[PDB]
């Protein structure tokens, strides 16, 4: 899909193996924010949001949190606290044809900067003057979309690049990567990884009642105390 209509897909209820993506080596940029690229195999999330689009290579930099630019401001703006990872790979051989590939289009003019993850599909003609032209583009009012016109001989900056932004949000776990589960052990100080929640302690059968919608119970200090029911206790420690 075109950048001005970047297409966002939902991924859930599956296992995502990011090791193959990391070691593919076919991606020009694999820049992961908030998560180390070789660290997602033990983690997992509620869902994955894959936003796909196409830009110029020189424009790959603009796709980043807190980055100012025409595309980043009026086509696809990431939040300042964005967590996820941006993948960009060159598609010149699949997107450039002799005579100019104008199928790729990007919106340029907009009255206000886009909010994070805010897709704008408005077809209204930008008004750059006091006098409205009533939708008939003319003086001081222009069409806000421009075409890339990719060419086979265009430079790296002008060569096309397909970009997929994977966004994660953690608010029960649904999509968890390739990590083999283990049998539960009780009454022994052990390291535990419950749906990507890592910790160490003793797990015991618990009598507290979790309502069907609750997953983990946190006591004071925001330290997890119970997890789906299992009571977590810091194994014996003290002074010597």
């Amino acid at each position, epitope marked *: 899909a075109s950048v001005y209509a970047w297409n966002r897909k939902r991924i859930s209820n599956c296992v995502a193996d990011y090791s193959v993506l990391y070691n593919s080596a076919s991606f020009s940029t694999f820049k992961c924010y908030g998560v180390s690229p070789t660290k997602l195999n033990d983690l997992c999330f509620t869902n994955v949001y894959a936003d796909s689009f196409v830009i110029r290579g020189d424009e790959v930099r603009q796709i980043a949190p807190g980055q100012t630019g025409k595309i980043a401001d009026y086509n696809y703006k990431l939040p300042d606290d964005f967590t996820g990872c941006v993948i960009a790979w060159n598609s010149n051989n699949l997107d450039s044809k002799v005579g100019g590939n104008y199928n790729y289009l990007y919106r340029l003019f907009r009255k206000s900067n886009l909010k994070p993850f805010e897709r704008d599909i408005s077809t209204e003609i930008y008004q750059a003057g006091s006098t409205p032209c009533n939708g*008939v583009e003319g003086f001081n009012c222009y069409f806000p979309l421009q075409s890339y016109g990719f060419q086979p001989t265009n430079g790296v900056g002008y060569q096309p690049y397909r970009v997929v932004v994977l966004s994660f949000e953690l608010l029960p776990a649904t999509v968890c990567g390739p990590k083999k589960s283990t049998n539960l052990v009780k009454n022994k100080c052990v390291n535990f990884n419950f749906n990507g929640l890592t910790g160490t302690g003793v797990l015991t059968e618990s009598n507290k009642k979790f309502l069907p919608f609750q997953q983990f119970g946190r006591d004071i200090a925001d330290t997890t105390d119970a997890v789906r029911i299992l009571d977590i206790t810091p194994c014996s420690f003290g002074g010597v």
Partner: nanobody
Amino acid sequence: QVQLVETGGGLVQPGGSLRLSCAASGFTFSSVYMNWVRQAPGKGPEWVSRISPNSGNIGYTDSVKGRFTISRDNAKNTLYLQMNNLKPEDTALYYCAIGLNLSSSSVRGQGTQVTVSS
């Protein structure tokens, strides 16, 4: 994803006025007009013609007076370029762009090569 699908233009012999259709989709057309632009091998693009949506004035370069005209239809949402006394030198790429006063390196379609076969 607005698609400026343009009808292909086959080889036509001199003596018959040639019509070239040019369509689009994915956006309102009665509000935005389109401009026809002629590009040739060995030289850059050349702005050919424009038509206003409301006034409907066909404006095109003096060097082409009397041999090119346009006709737009909102019902079918397309344009038709009519040219008479077509000559071999008209071998060209007649593509469409979203009409703008500047009409310089704006959005444009892939166009179709049309040549008059003597």
